[PDB]
Amino acid sequence: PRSLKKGPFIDLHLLKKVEKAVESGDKKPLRTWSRRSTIFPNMIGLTIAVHNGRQHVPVFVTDEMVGHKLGEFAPTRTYRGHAADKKAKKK
Amino acid sequence: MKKDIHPKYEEITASCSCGNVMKIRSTVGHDLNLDVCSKCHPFFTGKQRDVATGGRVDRFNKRFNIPGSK
Amino acid sequence: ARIAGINIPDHKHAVIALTSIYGVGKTRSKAILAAAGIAEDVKISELSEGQIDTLRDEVAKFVVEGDLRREISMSIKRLMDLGCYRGLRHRRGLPVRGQRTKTNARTRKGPRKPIKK
Amino acid sequence: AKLHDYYKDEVVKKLMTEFNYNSVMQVPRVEKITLNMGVGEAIADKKLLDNAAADLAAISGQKPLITKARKSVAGFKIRQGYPIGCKVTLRGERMWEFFERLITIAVPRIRDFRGLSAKSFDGRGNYSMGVREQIIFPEIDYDKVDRVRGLDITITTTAKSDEEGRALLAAFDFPFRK
RNA sequence: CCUCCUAAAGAGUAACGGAGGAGCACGAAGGUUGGCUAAUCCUGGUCGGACAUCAGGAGGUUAGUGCAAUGGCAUAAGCCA
RNA sequence: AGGGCUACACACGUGCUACAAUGGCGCAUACAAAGAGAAGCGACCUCGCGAGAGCAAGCGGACCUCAUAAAGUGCGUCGUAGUCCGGAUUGGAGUCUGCAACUCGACUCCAUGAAGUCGGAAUCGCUAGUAAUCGUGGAUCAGAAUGCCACGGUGAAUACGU
RNA sequence: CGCGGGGUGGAGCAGCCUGGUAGCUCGUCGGGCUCAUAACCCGAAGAUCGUCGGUUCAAAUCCGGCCCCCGCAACCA
């Protein structure tokens, strides 16, 4: 497995949208490119609309999902199935 | 009742009190008391940036430099 | 003499024999035999039942095999149930630790099969 | 055996007191336990029935009767009838003897287990103990790598409700499912 | 030629009238004495859960019957020792 | 900025390492050449299961360091059973490079643990310091080498004949 | 309308009797080589026996009904 070594992460990038969102508890999907950012306790119950390079995907953030980054729930690649080829991308 | 077919009792009735020489006298958890999730919930338990162990020498709060030594 | 029974491999080196109660690989079995005063290269048929007891106590703290093989199963299932990328790669069988798909799908998904073009 | 004289001494009196019954006769006693080991297949070969006997033998040494289909007209394969179960009937003192081995030695054998709901009792307070495997009473080199061969343990009763039904083997500690 | 029917409830009565079936089989597939209960669906279940045996309910011999049909059926021509 | 060149259905070119016991395992032991490192790499030190770590002598490279170069040497160990060879997948943590490790990064480690037993069609270089085979360093190089370039260890059959 | 023969994997056959086992020769599709095609080599797909029904644990086979192709048939003259 891989990690974040030793220094302190909230993500610098995500921080300025989040600090105003936690003040409300949760508010409308935070337009986010910051797919580089991990999930944490402060973030439980937010809604992060997560750019995947093509478009945003809402990730509803919750306690069972704190072992993960935001970038994992929103897909990137397409996989050609092999009964017959894959027609669509899947969200 | 078929009286005559009943086996000898040599290895039935003996020693329901036996020891642990290869196996237990009662098993735990065979009734499954929690369903196993196989997760720890990381950063919910434990810390968002890791344990600091290994290489313990007092830390210098004053600047230090790979090129600075001759 | 079987280590714990139910599934143990018969007439195996002393190191190898504990690789079937699980939670006890080579590293832990090597040190557990040195403790109990057993040499590595004896076959398991050479041990008396009181050496088998000295093994069995030192095992009995570790995970029982029915939960060990269940644990990797529930980990795979956990990941698919989140739909995180670990889990997405699991649906197809494809690498989860960054490995290539252009080759070396074989270890997870089995032998190659013919595909008309 | 000790089981039934205990069941008389302890359980029969519980149920008389607890239900406010009008007769002592209204109480359950233990009635015959046939067993099954519904192994199947081997229609001429009868080999998986000898493999069933080597499992049954570990817990009760008695001769397999080896069942045949009784009208032989079902949707299963028919050819020279069809072999199904094994029996091994437990009756009277031999069954009272068997139930005294159950719990004390049956519980250390199972390690992964999903049978035996106490709600699953219905109708007569009839039950069938789907144990998933063989409950091996004391033997040498019984573990050998093998499969399957659980048996129905079909307990029967002179019980006339479900509640009085579920109350056999209760002053015996089993971890029954809810 | 048998069994169901035309066929008119004795007399079973035509027609290249309607339909199913038979050309043997079995040295037990016979006799006698004694005991006994199913097709099927559900609940219990390890594999019988869908089908099966075991055990419980419902139904009450509707299964079976050497072979077609008719009659028959707990006294069980049904099943067994 | 995020995604991507490293997708995945498969097939194909190429290289690696293995399929053994001439070897692998363990403890102990030996000598290179050549070159890179003052954005950098570094002994001793103490810490860390190991990786690594902080401290810091040092190093302009025939000085100090990568580096104990490995194959090779000693001794016991294993018997064709995919093993005592091979160690891939995957669960999980510890650590590294970096303001970012999820698809697409590097290292240690615990448990569990497979294909492969000399490979169809296909297919190429070599005449001797070569072919074969081991280890090393370096260019590139924030983080990724099986590659490439060069170095040195050990080093083969035969070339009648046109 | 009668009477009789015939109805096999994409193509042409084997199997055929109370029936159980789908075989032969091609062709097809993917791949290799060849500068390319080719033959060649490797791998692979393919059957509700014309259709429907009956008996059975099993029906191409043995049976009942029908459609269609052909021979007869289109009078005894």
XYZ file of all heavy atoms in Angstrom, chain G residues 46-75:
633
model
P -20.864 -23.388 -30.212
O -21.852 -22.810 -29.295
O -20.037 -24.479 -29.699
O -21.558 -24.011 -31.553
C -22.270 -23.204 -32.447
C -22.497 -23.773 -33.722
O -21.282 -24.056 -34.414
C -23.088 -25.169 -33.547
O -24.487 -25.123 -33.363
C -22.896 -25.704 -34.970
O -23.835 -25.299 -35.952
C -21.521 -25.148 -35.225
N -20.449 -26.130 -34.831
C -20.115 -26.546 -33.585
N -19.356 -27.636 -33.551
C -19.252 -27.955 -34.926
C -18.530 -29.070 -35.495
O -17.879 -29.960 -34.907
N -18.648 -29.037 -36.870
C -19.143 -28.005 -37.614
N -18.958 -28.002 -38.921
N -19.806 -26.982 -37.167
C -19.769 -26.943 -35.714
P -25.382 -26.129 -32.339
O -26.701 -25.445 -32.344
O -24.625 -26.364 -31.073
O -25.343 -27.477 -33.305
C -25.904 -27.438 -34.600
C -27.086 -28.382 -34.795
O -26.699 -29.719 -34.913
C -28.063 -28.304 -33.574
O -28.995 -27.281 -33.834
C -28.556 -29.724 -33.585
O -29.441 -30.040 -34.668
C -27.262 -30.445 -33.865
N -26.432 -30.526 -32.626
C -26.759 -30.504 -31.277
N -25.823 -30.959 -30.483
C -24.719 -31.245 -31.314
C -23.362 -31.519 -31.023
N -22.991 -31.746 -29.807
N -22.511 -31.483 -32.047
C -22.953 -31.340 -33.256
N -24.212 -31.011 -33.728
C -25.106 -30.936 -32.656
P -29.902 -26.575 -32.665
O -30.653 -25.411 -33.206
O -29.004 -26.419 -31.514
O -30.909 -27.684 -32.207
C -32.020 -28.031 -33.015
C -32.765 -29.119 -32.298
O -33.160 -28.722 -31.002
C -34.009 -29.592 -33.032
O -34.269 -30.961 -32.784
C -35.073 -28.695 -32.454
O -36.430 -29.179 -32.617
C -34.577 -28.626 -30.928
N -35.165 -27.387 -30.357
C -34.370 -26.232 -30.169
O -33.266 -26.021 -30.703
N -34.998 -25.260 -29.343
C -36.273 -25.353 -28.790
O -36.711 -24.470 -28.037
C -37.025 -26.538 -29.108
C -36.464 -27.494 -29.907
P -33.645 -32.166 -33.640
O -33.834 -33.425 -32.837
O -32.298 -31.799 -34.138
O -34.572 -32.188 -34.939
C -35.138 -33.238 -35.701
C -34.351 -33.511 -36.995
O -32.903 -33.778 -36.767
C -34.899 -34.726 -37.764
O -34.770 -34.294 -39.088
C -33.952 -35.823 -37.094
O -34.047 -36.985 -37.958
C -32.565 -35.158 -37.017
N -31.620 -35.814 -36.007
C -30.894 -36.927 -36.272
O -30.979 -37.509 -37.378
N -30.148 -37.529 -35.295
C -30.090 -36.973 -34.077
N -29.403 -37.639 -33.126
C -30.842 -35.859 -33.716
C -31.565 -35.319 -34.706
P -35.997 -34.603 -40.104
O -37.295 -34.659 -39.352
O -35.636 -35.821 -40.853
O -36.162 -33.360 -41.208
C -35.819 -31.997 -41.014
C -36.914 -30.990 -41.265
O -37.836 -31.480 -42.319
C -37.894 -30.906 -40.097
O -37.387 -29.969 -39.173
C -39.162 -30.317 -40.711
O -38.935 -28.947 -41.272
C -39.230 -31.246 -41.919
N -40.015 -32.412 -41.580
C -39.620 -33.718 -41.495
N -40.619 -34.507 -41.282
C -41.732 -33.722 -41.260
C -43.123 -34.089 -41.289
O -43.721 -35.164 -41.115
N -43.947 -32.959 -41.446
C -43.525 -31.673 -41.500
N -44.471 -30.690 -41.487
N -42.206 -31.353 -41.407
C -41.360 -32.430 -41.372
P -37.866 -29.903 -37.582
O -37.182 -28.749 -37.026
O -37.671 -31.274 -37.011
O -39.423 -29.547 -37.625
C -39.981 -28.345 -37.890
C -41.466 -28.352 -37.590
O -42.177 -29.178 -38.564
C -41.909 -28.885 -36.187
O -41.789 -27.980 -35.087
C -43.338 -29.426 -36.414
O -44.278 -28.353 -36.353
C -43.244 -29.905 -37.837
N -42.963 -31.369 -37.992
C -43.971 -32.318 -37.937
O -45.150 -31.948 -37.883
N -43.678 -33.651 -37.936
C -42.372 -34.245 -37.998
O -42.208 -35.472 -38.149
C -41.412 -33.245 -38.017
C -41.650 -31.914 -38.047
P -41.742 -28.440 -33.587
O -41.654 -27.189 -32.793
O -40.710 -29.502 -33.383
O -43.184 -29.110 -33.272
C -44.364 -28.333 -33.153
C -45.620 -29.184 -32.924
O -45.992 -29.874 -34.182
C -45.661 -30.351 -31.897
O -45.840 -29.823 -30.666
C -46.793 -31.240 -32.357
O -48.099 -30.746 -32.191
C -46.528 -31.214 -33.836
N -45.614 -32.310 -34.213
C -46.291 -33.495 -34.566
O -47.466 -33.626 -34.386
N -45.608 -34.538 -35.017
C -44.277 -34.577 -35.045
N -43.662 -35.728 -35.318
C -43.510 -33.422 -34.596
C -44.212 -32.289 -34.312
P -45.253 -30.493 -29.282
O -45.513 -29.558 -28.177
O -43.862 -30.879 -29.598
O -46.077 -31.849 -28.981
C -47.402 -31.804 -28.532
C -48.150 -33.066 -28.809
O -47.968 -33.454 -30.209
C -47.750 -34.327 -27.993
O -48.253 -34.310 -26.643
C -48.453 -35.411 -28.779
O -49.878 -35.423 -28.681
C -48.115 -34.865 -30.227
N -46.847 -35.464 -30.658
C -45.558 -34.942 -30.744
N -44.653 -35.842 -31.086
C -45.350 -37.031 -31.203
C -44.769 -38.293 -31.526
O -43.624 -38.555 -31.697
N -45.786 -39.297 -31.349
C -47.113 -39.045 -31.105
N -47.868 -40.092 -30.736
N -47.669 -37.806 -30.977
C -46.701 -36.823 -30.981
P -47.622 -35.291 -25.559
O -48.246 -34.930 -24.269
O -46.140 -35.243 -25.720
O -47.921 -36.805 -25.871
C -49.249 -37.351 -25.836
C -49.030 -38.852 -26.018
O -48.529 -39.236 -27.248
C -48.063 -39.457 -24.956
O -48.641 -39.841 -23.627
C -47.550 -40.721 -25.704
O -48.345 -41.826 -25.530
C -47.606 -40.331 -27.188
N -46.259 -39.880 -27.644
C -45.740 -38.638 -27.866
N -44.485 -38.657 -28.217
C -44.152 -40.058 -28.322
C -42.912 -40.647 -28.634
O -41.902 -40.078 -28.959
N -42.983 -42.064 -28.803
C -44.184 -42.774 -28.585
N -44.282 -44.102 -28.744
N -45.301 -42.142 -28.116
C -45.260 -40.777 -28.076
N -43.459 -43.035 -24.452
C -42.228 -43.423 -24.905
N -41.373 -42.391 -25.240
C -41.697 -41.048 -25.242
C -42.902 -40.718 -24.632
C -43.794 -41.708 -24.343
O -41.829 -44.567 -25.046
O -40.914 -40.295 -25.810
C -44.373 -44.103 -24.046
C -44.092 -44.458 -22.600
O -44.146 -45.807 -22.200
C -45.152 -43.648 -21.794
C -46.291 -43.867 -22.857
O -45.534 -44.192 -20.579
O -45.664 -43.675 -24.080
C -47.457 -42.903 -22.619
O -46.912 -41.583 -22.653
P -47.728 -40.213 -22.426
O -48.689 -40.456 -21.349
O -46.685 -39.164 -22.128
N -41.221 -40.152 -21.646
C -40.201 -39.432 -22.340
N -39.081 -40.186 -22.569
C -38.864 -41.521 -22.072
C -39.999 -42.175 -21.435
C -41.141 -41.444 -21.199
O -40.338 -38.293 -22.862
O -37.777 -41.964 -22.208
C -39.808 -43.569 -20.951
C -39.164 -43.612 -19.562
O -38.321 -44.702 -19.585
C -40.371 -43.797 -18.717
C -41.152 -44.827 -19.585
O -39.995 -44.273 -17.473
O -41.027 -44.271 -20.869
C -42.611 -44.984 -19.111
O -43.307 -43.721 -19.214
P -44.941 -43.676 -19.161
O -45.472 -44.508 -18.058
O -45.243 -42.175 -19.050
P -39.845 -43.347 -16.233
O -39.611 -44.190 -15.039
O -40.952 -42.387 -16.278
O -38.459 -42.572 -16.427
C -38.053 -41.469 -15.599
C -36.575 -41.095 -15.865
O -35.670 -42.092 -15.268
C -36.086 -40.939 -17.333
O -36.354 -39.636 -17.838
C -34.602 -41.147 -17.174
O -33.897 -40.049 -16.639
C -34.638 -42.266 -16.197
N -34.658 -43.711 -16.683
C -33.375 -44.190 -17.093
O -32.354 -43.465 -17.007
N -33.288 -45.400 -17.672
C -34.396 -46.125 -17.952
N -34.313 -47.253 -18.674
C -35.708 -45.700 -17.563
C -35.784 -44.489 -16.962
P -37.093 -39.289 -19.242
O -37.237 -37.798 -19.410
O -38.318 -40.140 -19.359
O -35.922 -39.708 -20.291
C -34.645 -39.016 -20.410
C -33.796 -39.634 -21.431
O -33.398 -40.879 -20.988
C -34.380 -39.811 -22.764
O -34.488 -38.580 -23.507
C -33.492 -40.866 -23.457
O -32.258 -40.251 -23.971
C -33.149 -41.688 -22.189
N -34.105 -42.767 -21.972
C -35.091 -42.912 -21.017
N -35.591 -44.135 -20.989
C -35.000 -44.786 -22.022
C -34.992 -46.163 -22.547
N -35.773 -47.085 -22.055
N -34.237 -46.509 -23.580
C -33.424 -45.552 -24.099
N -33.227 -44.252 -23.685
C -34.049 -43.991 -22.638
P -35.525 -38.347 -24.726
O -35.071 -37.094 -25.293
O -36.903 -38.458 -24.205
O -35.324 -39.630 -25.782
C -34.227 -39.805 -26.718
C -34.769 -40.032 -28.176
O -35.631 -41.161 -28.240
C -35.642 -38.887 -28.710
O -35.362 -38.602 -30.097
C -37.125 -39.459 -28.581
O -37.958 -38.838 -29.521
C -36.808 -40.903 -28.975
N -37.851 -41.936 -28.573
C -39.087 -41.688 -27.991
N -39.850 -42.711 -27.809
C -39.116 -43.705 -28.416
C -39.364 -45.095 -28.584
N -40.427 -45.745 -28.081
N -38.486 -45.775 -29.282
C -37.380 -45.223 -29.763
N -36.981 -43.969 -29.665
C -37.937 -43.217 -28.977
P -34.161 -37.593 -30.521
O -32.905 -37.942 -29.822
O -34.792 -36.304 -30.296
O -34.039 -37.836 -32.122
C -34.891 -37.300 -33.113
C -34.816 -38.135 -34.348
O -33.485 -38.192 -34.869
C -35.390 -39.549 -34.372
O -36.665 -39.653 -34.814
C -34.459 -40.223 -35.426
O -34.913 -40.187 -36.682
C -33.105 -39.464 -35.414
N -32.110 -40.077 -34.505
C -31.815 -39.923 -33.148
N -30.683 -40.488 -32.788
C -30.259 -41.140 -33.911
C -29.115 -41.936 -34.177
N -28.217 -42.213 -33.253
N -29.034 -42.502 -35.376
C -29.900 -42.210 -36.365
N -30.937 -41.418 -36.283
C -31.100 -40.899 -35.018
P -37.717 -40.764 -34.154
O -39.039 -40.640 -34.769
O -37.608 -40.466 -32.701
O -37.180 -42.233 -34.377
C -37.103 -42.773 -35.702
C -36.208 -44.041 -35.713
O -34.869 -43.849 -35.216
C -36.813 -45.213 -35.019
O -36.624 -46.402 -35.756
C -36.120 -45.122 -33.692
O -36.149 -46.301 -32.985
C -34.736 -44.610 -34.069
N -34.081 -43.861 -32.970
C -32.683 -44.139 -32.853
O -32.074 -44.890 -33.585
N -32.042 -43.464 -31.816
C -32.589 -42.479 -31.056
O -31.882 -41.974 -30.235
C -33.976 -42.241 -31.297
C -34.684 -42.947 -32.243
P -37.770 -46.832 -36.795
O -37.389 -48.115 -37.420
O -38.333 -45.724 -37.616
O -38.870 -47.226 -35.691
C -39.055 -48.530 -35.245
C -40.172 -48.488 -34.205
O -39.712 -47.851 -33.014
C -41.404 -47.593 -34.595
O -42.308 -48.137 -35.613
C -42.025 -47.452 -33.161
O -42.772 -48.610 -32.877
C -40.793 -47.284 -32.277
N -40.671 -45.772 -32.065
C -41.637 -45.160 -31.261
O -42.586 -45.813 -30.846
N -41.464 -43.843 -30.951
C -40.382 -43.196 -31.400
N -40.278 -41.933 -30.957
C -39.391 -43.760 -32.230
C -39.589 -45.079 -32.566
P -43.158 -47.188 -36.570
O -43.813 -48.044 -37.549
O -42.260 -46.021 -36.960
O -44.231 -46.639 -35.452
C -45.262 -47.470 -34.929
C -46.280 -46.654 -34.124
O -45.603 -46.232 -32.995
C -47.001 -45.448 -34.670
O -48.213 -45.708 -35.400
C -47.302 -44.519 -33.505
O -48.498 -44.848 -32.793
C -46.069 -44.914 -32.640
N -44.890 -43.897 -32.635
C -45.213 -42.601 -32.129
O -46.099 -42.465 -31.255
N -44.445 -41.567 -32.566
C -43.348 -41.736 -33.341
N -42.533 -40.750 -33.673
C -43.028 -43.066 -33.851
C -43.863 -44.013 -33.502
P -48.652 -44.934 -36.708
O -49.496 -45.717 -37.572
O -47.565 -44.116 -37.243
O -49.608 -43.891 -35.970
C -50.855 -44.114 -35.381
C -51.295 -42.892 -34.584
O -50.416 -42.282 -33.667
C -51.399 -41.739 -35.631
O -52.439 -41.867 -36.622
C -51.544 -40.524 -34.705
O -52.778 -40.569 -34.048
C -50.465 -40.866 -33.685
N -49.118 -40.320 -34.048
C -48.076 -40.973 -34.611
N -47.018 -40.237 -34.859
C -47.436 -38.912 -34.616
C -46.762 -37.695 -34.799
O -45.639 -37.474 -35.241
N -47.574 -36.657 -34.448
C -48.857 -36.758 -34.050
N -49.548 -35.659 -33.932
N -49.535 -37.949 -33.865
C -48.737 -38.963 -34.111
P -52.389 -41.202 -38.081
O -53.558 -41.594 -38.876
O -51.013 -41.554 -38.549
O -52.423 -39.600 -37.661
C -53.575 -38.972 -37.117
C -53.472 -37.392 -37.181
O -52.385 -36.988 -36.277
C -53.079 -36.881 -38.552
O -54.188 -36.642 -39.457
C -52.386 -35.607 -38.109
O -53.403 -34.678 -37.762
C -51.603 -35.968 -36.849
N -50.175 -36.340 -37.182
C -49.592 -37.486 -37.597
N -48.348 -37.396 -37.998
C -48.106 -36.039 -37.866
C -46.900 -35.349 -38.129
O -45.850 -35.802 -38.483
N -47.060 -33.969 -37.943
C -48.253 -33.363 -37.507
N -48.323 -32.053 -37.345
N -49.340 -34.054 -37.216
C -49.196 -35.400 -37.383
P -53.887 -36.520 -41.061
O -55.170 -36.314 -41.738
O -53.036 -37.658 -41.461
O -53.030 -35.202 -41.325
C -53.445 -33.969 -40.929
C -52.448 -32.839 -40.903
O -51.375 -33.156 -40.000
C -51.774 -32.541 -42.186
O -52.552 -31.720 -42.887
C -50.543 -31.824 -41.729
O -50.779 -30.459 -41.297
C -50.108 -32.663 -40.496
N -49.089 -33.739 -40.743
C -47.756 -33.325 -40.957
O -47.342 -32.188 -40.722
N -46.804 -34.242 -41.234
C -47.113 -35.580 -41.364
N -46.133 -36.529 -41.550
C -48.571 -36.011 -41.220
C -49.485 -35.036 -40.900
P -52.648 -31.772 -44.528
O -53.810 -30.918 -44.962
O -52.584 -33.188 -44.870
O -51.237 -31.005 -44.895
C -51.053 -29.580 -44.639
C -49.585 -28.986 -44.828
O -48.678 -29.383 -43.849
C -48.933 -29.266 -46.170
O -49.511 -28.461 -47.197
C -47.447 -29.004 -45.731
O -47.066 -27.645 -45.536
C -47.392 -29.651 -44.369
N -46.990 -31.057 -44.406
C -45.654 -31.362 -44.443
O -44.724 -30.529 -44.558
N -45.244 -32.636 -44.358
C -46.115 -33.660 -44.510
N -45.626 -34.924 -44.550
C -47.508 -33.367 -44.688
C -47.913 -32.062 -44.551
P -49.583 -28.892 -48.688
O -50.166 -27.803 -49.528
O -50.245 -30.216 -48.629
O -48.044 -29.048 -48.966
C -47.177 -27.884 -49.007
C -45.716 -28.210 -49.214
O -45.245 -28.892 -48.039
C -45.429 -29.060 -50.383
O -45.348 -28.337 -51.626
C -44.127 -29.657 -49.945
O -43.089 -28.662 -50.028
C -44.271 -29.895 -48.458
N -44.675 -31.309 -48.207
C -43.698 -32.237 -48.096
O -42.539 -31.876 -47.870
N -43.931 -33.564 -48.204
C -45.208 -33.994 -48.447
N -45.512 -35.293 -48.563
C -46.290 -33.033 -48.492
C -45.964 -31.725 -48.496
P -45.450 -29.070 -53.069
O -45.569 -27.999 -54.099
O -46.505 -30.139 -52.969
O -44.020 -29.838 -53.242
C -42.760 -29.107 -53.341
C -41.599 -30.130 -53.598
O -41.211 -30.796 -52.391
C -41.912 -31.191 -54.630
O -41.715 -30.831 -56.033
C -40.707 -32.133 -54.256
O -39.369 -31.719 -54.615
C -40.878 -32.154 -52.723
N -41.932 -33.176 -52.347
C -41.737 -34.556 -52.453
O -40.608 -34.918 -52.824
N -42.723 -35.469 -52.320
C -43.946 -35.030 -51.861
N -44.932 -35.875 -51.521
C -44.276 -33.642 -51.846
C -43.213 -32.782 -52.082
P -42.638 -31.575 -57.177
O -42.329 -30.883 -58.473
O -44.077 -31.556 -56.726
O -42.058 -33.132 -57.345
C -40.798 -33.417 -57.871
C -40.642 -34.933 -57.831
O -40.653 -35.417 -56.525
C -41.719 -35.783 -58.552
O -41.507 -35.903 -59.922
C -41.731 -37.147 -57.822
O -40.634 -37.916 -58.340
C -41.370 -36.640 -56.420
N -42.601 -36.633 -55.536
C -43.003 -37.881 -55.100
O -42.291 -38.868 -55.142
N -44.290 -38.123 -54.666
C -45.160 -37.056 -54.643
N -46.366 -37.398 -54.140
C -44.752 -35.736 -55.143
C -43.481 -35.594 -55.564
P -42.634 -36.563 -60.871
O -42.172 -36.311 -62.244
O -43.905 -36.046 -60.495
O -42.645 -38.142 -60.548
C -41.718 -39.130 -61.019
C -42.266 -40.470 -60.466
O -42.231 -40.452 -59.010
C -43.710 -40.920 -60.768
O -43.918 -41.419 -62.087
C -43.879 -41.914 -59.660
O -43.328 -43.181 -59.991
C -43.278 -41.201 -58.437
N -44.391 -40.468 -57.857
C -44.811 -39.169 -58.099
N -45.807 -38.777 -57.367
C -46.158 -39.970 -56.626
C -47.312 -40.203 -55.736
O -48.087 -39.326 -55.406
N -47.483 -41.488 -55.378
C -46.635 -42.545 -55.872
N -46.986 -43.790 -55.475
N -45.506 -42.325 -56.643
C -45.391 -41.028 -57.027
P -45.222 -41.248 -62.941
O -44.980 -41.762 -64.315
O -45.656 -39.860 -62.693
O -46.370 -42.253 -62.282
C -46.228 -43.664 -62.203
C -47.129 -44.095 -61.076
O -46.829 -43.322 -59.939
C -48.622 -43.844 -61.402
O -49.285 -44.842 -62.127
C -49.170 -43.793 -59.951
O -49.429 -45.095 -59.419
C -48.046 -43.103 -59.164
N -48.422 -41.718 -58.920
C -49.429 -41.623 -58.016
O -49.888 -42.520 -57.347
N -50.015 -40.398 -57.836
C -49.488 -39.266 -58.370
N -50.130 -38.121 -58.226
C -48.250 -39.325 -59.101
C -47.777 -40.591 -59.387
P -50.579 -44.501 -63.071
O -51.187 -45.760 -63.455
O -49.955 -43.629 -64.145
O -51.520 -43.602 -62.065
C -52.422 -44.081 -61.057
C -53.004 -42.868 -60.396
O -52.040 -41.969 -59.875
C -53.744 -42.077 -61.459
O -55.042 -42.642 -61.460
C -53.699 -40.697 -60.929
O -54.717 -40.524 -59.896
C -52.405 -40.672 -60.220
N -51.392 -40.034 -61.206
C -50.385 -40.571 -62.007
N -49.551 -39.723 -62.425
C -49.952 -38.461 -62.040
C -49.434 -37.208 -62.147
N -48.292 -36.906 -62.795
N -50.084 -36.212 -61.500
C -51.305 -36.459 -61.106
N -52.008 -37.617 -61.038
C -51.222 -38.618 -61.458
P -56.062 -42.755 -62.685
O -57.449 -42.898 -62.224
O -55.491 -43.769 -63.668
O -55.918 -41.250 -63.430
C -56.918 -40.361 -63.195
C -56.792 -39.085 -64.045
O -55.497 -38.438 -63.883
C -56.786 -39.415 -65.592
O -58.080 -39.640 -66.209
C -56.279 -38.088 -66.099
O -57.337 -37.046 -66.070
C -55.246 -37.716 -65.057
N -53.828 -37.993 -65.523
C -53.235 -39.095 -66.179
N -51.948 -39.087 -66.260
C -51.641 -37.847 -65.757
C -50.392 -37.172 -65.803
N -49.386 -37.838 -66.345
N -50.309 -35.817 -65.539
C -51.469 -35.214 -65.222
N -52.684 -35.784 -65.103
C -52.749 -37.124 -65.392
P -58.232 -40.499 -67.609
O -56.919 -40.677 -68.359
O -59.346 -39.868 -68.306
O -58.748 -41.885 -67.076
C -57.836 -42.638 -66.285
C -58.454 -43.787 -65.472
O -59.672 -43.412 -64.765
C -58.690 -44.919 -66.503
O -58.037 -46.049 -65.848
C -60.211 -45.064 -66.322
O -60.797 -46.396 -66.304
C -60.455 -44.571 -64.934
N -61.953 -44.328 -64.697
C -62.642 -45.165 -63.835
O -62.040 -45.873 -63.019
N -64.020 -45.118 -63.923
C -64.666 -44.295 -64.739
N -65.965 -44.186 -64.540
C -63.970 -43.486 -65.693
C -62.621 -43.443 -65.545
